[PDB]
């Protein structure tokens, strides 16, 4: 409805090229999404600025990715740091 | 079962927030005026001050003084501790209330001089 494929990117009209609009689409969606708060258990985490993710209700503010709360390498880094910490013992 | 007369509590709200008190009477079910469970407590409005050997005799007598308050507190405004202070209290007007406060002050000042219950007279830091 209202659009067959543009979605959030229809605000850009006919400008900038179809491939660039398709490129920006995933980050426009992800940066405006609501994320799960591990501290309180609600989907209330919103981007306050690039890298800054604040929960609406519990008030926790977390440092994360530019356009998504958790980057892929952040999970990988945490697992590497956790394995190094345990094997250190 | 741990909210009984003689048990020590901490007030969490109000004018005496953060003060230590002892339970005197428990209305577990609550009266008609107060449907909720509540207790009568006797607390320290002014803690006895730090008493040290270097002090003179008159000064350490002034530092050992306490002030006592009487208050009815909702159960939800109380942090129940594991400590116990028994001084045989067994307890309306603005004259009866203040007189009863002075009696508890004499008993609590005497307990403090005994040296026991050091936690009860040593304030809380927050």
């Amino acid at each position: 409805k209202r659009t067959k494929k543009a979605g959030i990117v229809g605000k850009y009209g006919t400008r900038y090229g179809a491939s660039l609009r398709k490129q920006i689409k995933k980050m426009e969606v992800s940066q405006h999404s609501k994320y799960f708060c591990e501290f309180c258990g609600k989907f209330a985490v919103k981007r306050k600025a690039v890298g800054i993710w604040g929960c609406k209700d519990c008030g926790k503010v977390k440092a994360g990715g530019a356009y998504t709360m958790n980057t892929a390498s952040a999970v990988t880094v945490r697992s590497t740091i956790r394995r190094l910490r345990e094997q250190t013992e | 079962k741990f909210l009984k007369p003689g048990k020590a509590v901490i007030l969490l709200q109000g004018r005496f927030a953060g003060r230590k008190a002892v339970i005197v009477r428990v209305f577990e079910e609550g009266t008609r005026d107060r449907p909720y469970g509540h207790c009568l407590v006797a607390g320290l409005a002014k803690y006895p001050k730090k008493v040290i050997r270097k002090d003179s005799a008159k000064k350490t007598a002034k530092k050992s003084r306490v002030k006592c308050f009487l208050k009815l507190v909702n159960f939800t405004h109380i942090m129940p501790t594991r400590y116990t202070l028994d001084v045989d209290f067994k307890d309306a007007t603005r004259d009866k209330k203040v007189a009863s406060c002075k009696a508890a002050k004499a008993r609590l000042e005497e307990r403090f001089k005994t040296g026991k219950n050091r936690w009860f007279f040593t304030k809380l830091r927050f």
Binding site: E38, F39, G41 | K1, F2, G37, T76, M79, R82
Partner: protein, 95 residues
């Protein structure tokens, strides 16, 4: 096997859900067991364990989230803590 036993307590026993009613049952010593979610606020968690130590009530730390609790109890809202006051035909207490 704790999700099934908790599922049976909601079907036949008596319980209460939520912080304020968990504290009330501890004050009146009606709860037989306290269950805490793993993301329950650390100040809140400490106070409930201290209340349970004042009485003689056991506390179990639920293996999952506060979203997972409540779902285990078959409700569509989150549950931070649970208090069991009657299991009836459930062996949750003896474990």
């Amino acid at each position: 096997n704790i999700n099934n036993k908790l599922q049976l307590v909601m079907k036949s026993g008596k319980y209460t859900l939520g912080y304020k009613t968990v504290l009330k049952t501890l004050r009146s010593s009606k709860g037989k067991l306290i269950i805490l979610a793993n993301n329950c606020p650390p100040l809140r968690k400490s106070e409930i364990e201290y209340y349970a130590m004042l009485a003689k009530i056991s506390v179990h730390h639920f293996h999952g989230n506060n979203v997972d609790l409540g779902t285990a109890c078959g409700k569509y809202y989150r549950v931070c803590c649970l208090s069991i006051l009657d299991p009836g035909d459930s062996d949750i207490i003896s474990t």
